[PDB]
Amino acid sequence: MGRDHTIHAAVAGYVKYYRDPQLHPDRQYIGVVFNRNDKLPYPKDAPRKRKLGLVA
Amino acid sequence: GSWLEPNLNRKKKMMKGRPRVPTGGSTKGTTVVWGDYGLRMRDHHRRISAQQLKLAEDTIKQRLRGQKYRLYKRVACNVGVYVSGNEMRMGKGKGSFDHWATRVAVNQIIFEIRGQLHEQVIRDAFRLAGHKLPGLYEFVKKGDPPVVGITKLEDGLTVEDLKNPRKK
RNA sequence: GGCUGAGUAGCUCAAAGUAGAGCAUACCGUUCAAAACGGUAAUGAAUGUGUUCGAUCCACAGCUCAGCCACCA
RNA sequence: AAAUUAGAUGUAAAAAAAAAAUCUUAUGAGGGCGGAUCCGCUUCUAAUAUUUUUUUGUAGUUAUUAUUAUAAUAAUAAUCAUGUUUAUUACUUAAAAAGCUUAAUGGCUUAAUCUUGCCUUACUGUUUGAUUAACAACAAAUCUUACAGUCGCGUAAGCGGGGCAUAGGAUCACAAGAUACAAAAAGGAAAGAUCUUGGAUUUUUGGAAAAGCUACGCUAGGGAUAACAGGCUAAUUUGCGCAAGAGUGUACAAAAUGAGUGCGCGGUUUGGCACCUCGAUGUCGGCUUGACUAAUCCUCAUGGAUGCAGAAACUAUGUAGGGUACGACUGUUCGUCGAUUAAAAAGUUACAUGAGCUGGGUUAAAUACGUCGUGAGACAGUAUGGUU
RNA sequence: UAACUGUGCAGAUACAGUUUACCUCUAGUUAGACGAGAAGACCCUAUGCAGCUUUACUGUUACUAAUUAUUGAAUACGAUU
RNA sequence: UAAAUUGAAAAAAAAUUUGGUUUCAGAGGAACCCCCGGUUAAUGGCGGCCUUAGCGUGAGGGUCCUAAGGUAGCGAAAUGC
RNA sequence: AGACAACACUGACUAGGAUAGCUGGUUUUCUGCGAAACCUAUAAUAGUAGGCAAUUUAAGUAACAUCUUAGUAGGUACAGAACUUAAUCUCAGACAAGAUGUAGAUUUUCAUACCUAGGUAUGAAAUGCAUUUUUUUUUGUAUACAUCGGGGGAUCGUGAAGAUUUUAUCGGUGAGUAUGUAGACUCGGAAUGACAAAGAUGAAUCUUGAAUAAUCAGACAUAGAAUGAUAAGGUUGUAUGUCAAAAGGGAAACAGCCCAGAACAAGAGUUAAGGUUCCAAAAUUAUUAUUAAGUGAAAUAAAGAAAGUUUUUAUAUAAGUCGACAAGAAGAUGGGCUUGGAAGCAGCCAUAAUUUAAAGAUCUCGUAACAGAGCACUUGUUAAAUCUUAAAAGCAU
Ligand SMILES: [K+]
Ligand SMILES: [K+]
Ligand SMILES: [K+]
Ligand SMILES: [K+]
Ligand SMILES: [K+]
Ligand SMILES: [K+]
Ligand SMILES: [K+]
Ligand SMILES: [K+]
Ligand SMILES: [K+]
Ligand SMILES: [K+]
Ligand SMILES: [Mg+2]
Ligand SMILES: [Mg+2]
Ligand SMILES: [Mg+2]
Ligand SMILES: [Mg+2]
Ligand SMILES: [Mg+2]
Ligand SMILES: [Mg+2]
Ligand SMILES: [Mg+2]
Ligand SMILES: [Mg+2]
Ligand SMILES: [Mg+2]
Ligand SMILES: [Mg+2]
Ligand SMILES: [Mg+2]
Ligand SMILES: [Mg+2]
Ligand SMILES: [Mg+2]
Ligand SMILES: [Mg+2]
Ligand SMILES: [Mg+2]
Ligand SMILES: [Mg+2]
Ligand SMILES: [Mg+2]
Ligand SMILES: [Mg+2]
Ligand SMILES: [Mg+2]
Ligand SMILES: [Mg+2]
Ligand SMILES: [Mg+2]
Ligand SMILES: [Mg+2]
Ligand SMILES: [Mg+2]
Ligand SMILES: [Mg+2]
Ligand SMILES: [Mg+2]
Ligand SMILES: [Mg+2]
Ligand SMILES: [Mg+2]
Ligand SMILES: [Mg+2]
Ligand SMILES: [Mg+2]
Ligand SMILES: [Mg+2]
């Protein structure tokens, strides 16, 4: 989130508009997933899906 | 305030606006809820002024004076009409306050009366009040069905039968 | 028709942390009586509603208003 | 009426176990099969969630009551408690409002608010990706990323390139610091260049140092734009009708009369719009000469009239053939007035008619009065004169 | 090179519909051809002009004031110090 | 900036004096102006409010302000909406 | 007198040296493509620049457009009254127990007197209706303990004071899943439109390189708004199209409307909008109703009136509907009051009865007041075998 409350992308992925009732009951979030077919919010018990983002 | 002079500020101007035109099957305000009889506008939606409604009440009181009745008003003059001079030119802002008014939809009740009087004595009172009000009015009893648009829900007709694309 | 400036004691006029000073009025005393005179007292911020810690004061809408502009065919 | 202080929701805190099913997930079994970790199909296992689901268990401790032989069993009640009871901890307590630098809007209560400790990243250079390619261009802007340098806070993770967000104008010139670039013969210097920074109603705020008259006026243009008339419109009118009936009429609504209203016609007023005409549509009254409309002043036929005895008159229905004159006042249309008359009504036609006339008014040059302006001058202020 | 009503850049000899009219001159007359004449003086526009006005901006002068120079003395009186 | 002196004398400036060059600086010191006064047949300017011998009228009496408050005369006027 | 200074003078004539963001004009043909009247800036608004973007022809395309399937953003119409706004309506209070009284029935239980455990006596209680109870000197339960002032009246009362109760009076407060209201209310919520992904289709329609314009006075129709006056061929936005720059057919005539995009000819060719008796190409084509007014027939004049007509739905009728005609339409009683007078009939109050085939203490006239004539209502006669009355709707006047 920016200084003026602007939501940017931190990684190369696909935008998602969802609600996470576990984190906060009355909030709506925006996220970026690496796979277009992913579904947010991820289950709290699933491993973090992260990309390397490095070149050898 | 009152039903002809609300507790609003004349400084803050209002737009012209338009009366409510229910196009979704709304019977809001088309029935007698308090009195035994009513006065229904049955031609078109308008914007009645506080001066035309004040004369209607005075016309009913003059005809029913000396008798026991209870007149209910189902409309409130809560729309401030602002008029610029008919001699002025176009532009130079909006006009100044002229009078209070109320927007009435079609087939909506205006007045309702409840008293120990004869039906025909009330008809003449509502008949005289209609000749001095803008538009055409109708005598309505209590218990009769509501009106969706310009069609009455009579003979088992429901709002879903009017929404059904097939009617023939 | 269209803008502007004013409104405080009975009468005058002065003044966002105040309402003052005159004249008039009243009581008494001076004179045979009255006036003048002398002494001692009491009198107000229009009409609401807002702003402000607090409004004669700033803002807004009415009443009273006065003043000014209503030009070219 | 208005000063301070103390209050203003409820719940939980011994503890579960097991069976199946419906999905969803898995960087689980490197599952299997087609093409270890790539992809669509795929069983199994695990986890979260969901069924009102099939249930099982709900004790122990203290005490009471009853039975049984102080103990056992059953039921009932209380039970967060090894802990300074001012307990404590977790969860819950609508919305609005308060607070968050200033208006308004949105947002924050799990922090962007408040309290306290230590601090001053309100850092230097460069740089990424965006604002569906900022403002429907450019520029001045806004948010964000990374590397290097070196500082703060924090156990740590990490956070920090000012403030919860959205409202502070350049260049030039000028002034203060730095860089070591160039130095018009040469050594210096001056005056320049780069980097950082300051002083602006440059408020016509993409940024000129800036008052009026013209009726003596001129040129280039405009029906892209006013005055006259036409067109559209019909608020309004000095033009009318219909409906209803408060009330007046000694009585009795509708003989007459008709509050405040409603539904309309009409195109004769004042307006609104700016469609035609500014390489040109002459204008208020008067005279002359018409034509037409009918919402009728007179004349003709006629209904109603406690309020039509007669007469006269009122009102209304037919009806526009003819007539509606004279004079004083005013530029006047209009209007006032005198005296006659059967009566001395109106309107449309470019408010009919100036290539038919007149020119008194309005509206040029001259001049004066009053008023306004510092003045030149101006004036729906008034005067005398002024190529038709 | 007719009349009416309607239409239309919104007032038609020329368009629509209907009506009326044998061809062609002469003398009269001026209702229309938004008749002719003068690229509207009115009004507005142009970062167009001209003259005039003033405590408009920026300037030049008449005029006023001081002084080097042409130009030398002498007492004073006095002040700076 | 040149020379000299001084200083530094380490990779070194820096300061003073003089020549040349280029800036800052103002005790005293004119008119207009400031200050004082005069001038209206100079340009020009020449006001409000309440109160009353009864209603009335307002001689009279209250006060505010100005440089002064329009005097004589004229007056629905070439001036009056 | 801005008067005159030789056509000209608010500054002559003549020679030399201008500009004009303004108006007007710009000359042959064929062929291809094809705008705009918008945004931003401008001492700028009838000018200009940069964009959007027209053109040329090269290189690219996982281009562009459209549909399908899945997904996302956002709150309009609508609907609703939650939050907020205006106004209006209803309510502001109940049960259980206990307690406090009364007429009883005189049975049972209990407490006393006893008596000899019952009975004999004395009290209470039970049983039935009242009474007290939302803050009371009445606790509990359920709920928002659930309401505060002005004023009016009444009953007390003090030297003026005020104190204490009531109201279907005004304002305020609380409750309501009560009614309405909406540019700055949206709890609920479309379609449309927008964004991106894959697939498919299609007329290259897209992007970039190079080269390089015009336009920046728009108009109307339809929908929905602001403004005006719910006027304008009005002004200003939005959505779509046409005109502009588009001829042709239809709308009598026609920039903007309904169709349809003109390269040139032929055809009783095939069709759109629109039409088919004649002018004038094609039906005097079939079916069922309505209208009698030339209504109307290609630009709907309103409210409103009415034995116009038709249909439908009710309803009356040989138990004689409907209409007419004949008679009756009483009595207590001139109701009471008022009034000079009020007898049904100026006005005020009352208007349970009585007797009848039926008859209002009275609906329209009449009288100074009575009288009198009609009506409601009642009987009879005449007489209809699809034929009464009223309403609604359709088309007409
Ligand atoms: K801190
Ligand atoms: K050099
Ligand atoms: K003369
Ligand atoms: K034209
Ligand atoms: K002529
Ligand atoms: K221009
Ligand atoms: K072509
Ligand atoms: K083409
Ligand atoms: K919503
Ligand atoms: K006809
Ligand atoms: Mg009406
Ligand atoms: Mg803060
Ligand atoms: Mg852009
Ligand atoms: Mg600007
Ligand atoms: Mg800008
Ligand atoms: Mg003159
Ligand atoms: Mg025009
Ligand atoms: Mg008669
Ligand atoms: Mg004749
Ligand atoms: Mg004329
Ligand atoms: Mg003529
Ligand atoms: Mg015509
Ligand atoms: Mg022809
Ligand atoms: Mg002639
Ligand atoms: Mg012609
Ligand atoms: Mg000096
Ligand atoms: Mg001196
Ligand atoms: Mg005088
Ligand atoms: Mg002159
Ligand atoms: Mg001359
Ligand atoms: Mg366009
Ligand atoms: Mg500029
Ligand atoms: Mg228009
Ligand atoms: Mg226009
Ligand atoms: Mg054009
Ligand atoms: Mg066409
Ligand atoms: Mg035809
Ligand atoms: Mg054929
Ligand atoms: Mg034929
Ligand atoms: Mg009586």
GROMACS .gro file of N, CA, C and O in nm, chain B residues 103-150:
model
  192
  159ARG      N    1  -4.462   1.633  -0.474
  159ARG     CA    2  -4.473   1.552  -0.594
  159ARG      C    3  -4.557   1.428  -0.565
  159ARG      O    4  -4.529   1.355  -0.469
  160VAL      N    5  -4.660   1.406  -0.646
  160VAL     CA    6  -4.753   1.295  -0.627
  160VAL      C    7  -4.745   1.204  -0.748
  160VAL      O    8  -4.748   1.252  -0.863
  161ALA      N    9  -4.736   1.074  -0.724
  161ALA     CA   10  -4.740   0.976  -0.830
  161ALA      C   11  -4.885   0.949  -0.870
  161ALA      O   12  -4.980   0.994  -0.806
  162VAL      N   13  -4.901   0.873  -0.978
  162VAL     CA   14  -5.034   0.844  -1.030
  162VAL      C   15  -5.102   0.740  -0.941
  162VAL      O   16  -5.036   0.649  -0.889
  163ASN      N   17  -5.233   0.754  -0.924
  163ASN     CA   18  -5.313   0.660  -0.846
  163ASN      C   19  -5.270   0.657  -0.700
  163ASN      O   20  -5.271   0.552  -0.635
  164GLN      N   21  -5.234   0.774  -0.647
  164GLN     CA   22  -5.196   0.788  -0.507
  164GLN      C   23  -5.304   0.865  -0.432
  164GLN      O   24  -5.365   0.957  -0.487
  165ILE      N   25  -5.326   0.826  -0.307
  165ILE     CA   26  -5.427   0.891  -0.225
  165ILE      C   27  -5.375   1.026  -0.179
  165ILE      O   28  -5.255   1.043  -0.150
  166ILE      N   29  -5.465   1.124  -0.172
  166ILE     CA   30  -5.432   1.259  -0.126
  166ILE      C   31  -5.485   1.282   0.015
  166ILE      O   32  -5.408   1.309   0.107
  167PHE      N   33  -5.616   1.273   0.032
  167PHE     CA   34  -5.682   1.292   0.160
  167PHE      C   35  -5.752   1.163   0.201
  167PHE      O   36  -5.782   1.077   0.118
  168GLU      N   37  -5.779   1.151   0.331
  168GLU     CA   38  -5.859   1.042   0.384
  168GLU      C   39  -5.944   1.096   0.498
  168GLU      O   40  -5.896   1.176   0.579
  169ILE      N   41  -6.069   1.053   0.502
  169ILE     CA   42  -6.165   1.104   0.599
  169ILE      C   43  -6.228   0.987   0.674
  169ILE      O   44  -6.250   0.879   0.618
  170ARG      N   45  -6.258   1.010   0.802
  170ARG     CA   46  -6.322   0.911   0.887
  170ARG      C   47  -6.417   0.983   0.981
  170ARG      O   48  -6.373   1.058   1.069
  171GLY      N   49  -6.547   0.962   0.962
  171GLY     CA   50  -6.646   1.028   1.044
  171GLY      C   51  -6.778   0.955   1.038
  171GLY      O   52  -6.798   0.863   0.959
  172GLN      N   53  -6.870   0.999   1.124
  172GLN     CA   54  -7.005   0.941   1.130
  172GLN      C   55  -7.099   1.015   1.035
  172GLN      O   56  -7.205   1.062   1.074
  173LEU      N   57  -7.059   1.024   0.909
  173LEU     CA   58  -7.134   1.095   0.806
  173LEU      C   59  -7.175   0.999   0.696
  173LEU      O   60  -7.124   0.887   0.684
  174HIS      N   61  -7.268   1.045   0.613
  174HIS     CA   62  -7.316   0.965   0.501
  174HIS      C   63  -7.214   0.967   0.387
  174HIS      O   64  -7.147   1.068   0.363
  175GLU      N   65  -7.204   0.854   0.317
  175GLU     CA   66  -7.109   0.843   0.207
  175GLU      C   67  -7.130   0.953   0.104
  175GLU      O   68  -7.033   1.014   0.058
  176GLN      N   69  -7.255   0.979   0.067
  176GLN     CA   70  -7.283   1.081  -0.034
  176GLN      C   71  -7.249   1.221   0.014
  176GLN      O   72  -7.226   1.310  -0.069
  177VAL      N   73  -7.245   1.244   0.145
  177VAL     CA   74  -7.203   1.374   0.196
  177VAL      C   75  -7.052   1.390   0.182
  177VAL      O   76  -7.001   1.502   0.169
  178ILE      N   77  -6.978   1.279   0.186
  178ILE     CA   78  -6.834   1.286   0.168
  178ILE      C   79  -6.798   1.297   0.020
  178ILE      O   80  -6.700   1.362  -0.016
  179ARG      N   81  -6.876   1.233  -0.068
  179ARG     CA   82  -6.850   1.242  -0.211
  179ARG      C   83  -6.853   1.386  -0.259
  179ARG      O   84  -6.765   1.430  -0.334
  180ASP      N   85  -6.954   1.462  -0.216
  180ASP     CA   86  -6.963   1.602  -0.257
  180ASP      C   87  -6.845   1.683  -0.206
  180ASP      O   88  -6.804   1.780  -0.271
  181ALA      N   89  -6.789   1.645  -0.092
  181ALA     CA   90  -6.672   1.716  -0.040
  181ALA      C   91  -6.548   1.684  -0.122
  181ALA      O   92  -6.471   1.774  -0.157
  182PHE      N   93  -6.527   1.556  -0.153
  182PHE     CA   94  -6.414   1.517  -0.237
  182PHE      C   95  -6.436   1.555  -0.383
  182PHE      O   96  -6.338   1.569  -0.457
  183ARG      N   97  -6.561   1.570  -0.425
  183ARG     CA   98  -6.588   1.613  -0.562
  183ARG      C   99  -6.555   1.760  -0.581
  183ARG      O  100  -6.503   1.800  -0.685
  184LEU      N  101  -6.584   1.843  -0.480
  184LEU     CA  102  -6.551   1.985  -0.489
  184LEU      C  103  -6.401   2.007  -0.477
  184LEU      O  104  -6.346   2.097  -0.541
  185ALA      N  105  -6.334   1.927  -0.394
  185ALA     CA  106  -6.189   1.941  -0.380
  185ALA      C  107  -6.116   1.898  -0.506
  185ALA      O  108  -6.004   1.944  -0.530
  186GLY      N  109  -6.176   1.810  -0.586
  186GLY     CA  110  -6.113   1.770  -0.710
  186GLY      C  111  -6.127   1.871  -0.822
  186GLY      O  112  -6.038   1.882  -0.907
  187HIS      N  113  -6.237   1.947  -0.824
  187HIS     CA  114  -6.253   2.049  -0.926
  187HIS      C  115  -6.160   2.167  -0.906
  187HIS      O  116  -6.146   2.249  -0.997
  188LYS      N  117  -6.097   2.178  -0.789
  188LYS     CA  118  -6.007   2.288  -0.759
  188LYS      C  119  -5.862   2.244  -0.744
  188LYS      O  120  -5.774   2.328  -0.723
  189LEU      N  121  -5.835   2.115  -0.755
  189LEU     CA  122  -5.700   2.062  -0.754
  189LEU      C  123  -5.653   2.036  -0.896
  189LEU      O  124  -5.734   2.016  -0.987
  190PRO      N  125  -5.522   2.036  -0.919
  190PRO     CA  126  -5.471   2.011  -1.055
  190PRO      C  127  -5.486   1.864  -1.091
  190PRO      O  128  -5.436   1.776  -1.020
  191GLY      N  129  -5.554   1.838  -1.201
  191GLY     CA  130  -5.572   1.703  -1.250
  191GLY      C  131  -5.709   1.647  -1.219
  191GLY      O  132  -5.803   1.718  -1.179
  192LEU      N  133  -5.720   1.516  -1.238
  192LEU     CA  134  -5.843   1.442  -1.217
  192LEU      C  135  -5.829   1.352  -1.095
  192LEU      O  136  -5.722   1.293  -1.073
  193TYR      N  137  -5.936   1.340  -1.017
  193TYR     CA  138  -5.934   1.264  -0.894
  193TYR      C  139  -6.052   1.167  -0.892
  193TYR      O  140  -6.143   1.174  -0.974
  194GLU      N  141  -6.047   1.075  -0.795
  194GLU     CA  142  -6.143   0.966  -0.787
  194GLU      C  143  -6.175   0.937  -0.641
  194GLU      O  144  -6.092   0.957  -0.552
  195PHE      N  145  -6.298   0.891  -0.618
  195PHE     CA  146  -6.343   0.853  -0.485
  195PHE      C  147  -6.307   0.708  -0.457
  195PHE      O  148  -6.340   0.619  -0.536
  196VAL      N  149  -6.238   0.685  -0.346
  196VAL     CA  150  -6.186   0.553  -0.311
  196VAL      C  151  -6.238   0.513  -0.174
  196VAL      O  152  -6.246   0.596  -0.083
  197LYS      N  153  -6.273   0.386  -0.160
  197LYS     CA  154  -6.315   0.329  -0.034
  197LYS      C  155  -6.201   0.250   0.029
  197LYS      O  156  -6.095   0.231  -0.031
  198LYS      N  157  -6.224   0.203   0.151
  198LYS     CA  158  -6.127   0.121   0.222
  198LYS      C  159  -6.151  -0.026   0.191
  198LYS      O  160  -6.266  -0.071   0.187
  199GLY      N  161  -6.042  -0.100   0.171
  199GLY     CA  162  -6.048  -0.241   0.142
  199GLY      C  163  -6.026  -0.275  -0.004
  199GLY      O  164  -5.983  -0.387  -0.035
  200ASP      N  165  -6.055  -0.182  -0.094
  200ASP     CA  166  -6.034  -0.208  -0.236
  200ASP      C  167  -5.885  -0.228  -0.263
  200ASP      O  168  -5.800  -0.176  -0.190
  201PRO      N  169  -5.850  -0.303  -0.367
  201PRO     CA  170  -5.711  -0.341  -0.387
  201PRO      C  171  -5.626  -0.222  -0.427
  201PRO      O  172  -5.680  -0.115  -0.460
  202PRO      N  173  -5.494  -0.236  -0.424
  202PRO     CA  174  -5.406  -0.127  -0.466
  202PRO      C  175  -5.402  -0.117  -0.618
  202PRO      O  176  -5.470  -0.190  -0.690
  203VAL      N  177  -5.320  -0.024  -0.667
  203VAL     CA  178  -5.308   0.004  -0.809
  203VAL      C  179  -5.160  -0.002  -0.847
  203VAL      O  180  -5.078   0.070  -0.788
  204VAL      N  181  -5.127  -0.086  -0.944
  204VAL     CA  182  -4.992  -0.097  -0.996
  204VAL      C  183  -4.989  -0.024  -1.130
  204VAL      O  184  -5.040  -0.074  -1.230
  205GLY      N  185  -4.929   0.095  -1.131
  205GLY     CA  186  -4.927   0.175  -1.251
  205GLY      C  187  -5.060   0.245  -1.274
  205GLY      O  188  -5.093   0.342  -1.206
  206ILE      N  189  -5.136   0.196  -1.372
  206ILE     CA  190  -5.268   0.249  -1.401
  206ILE      C  191  -5.368   0.134  -1.406
  206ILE      O  192  -5.480   0.150  -1.456
   0.00000   0.00000   0.00000
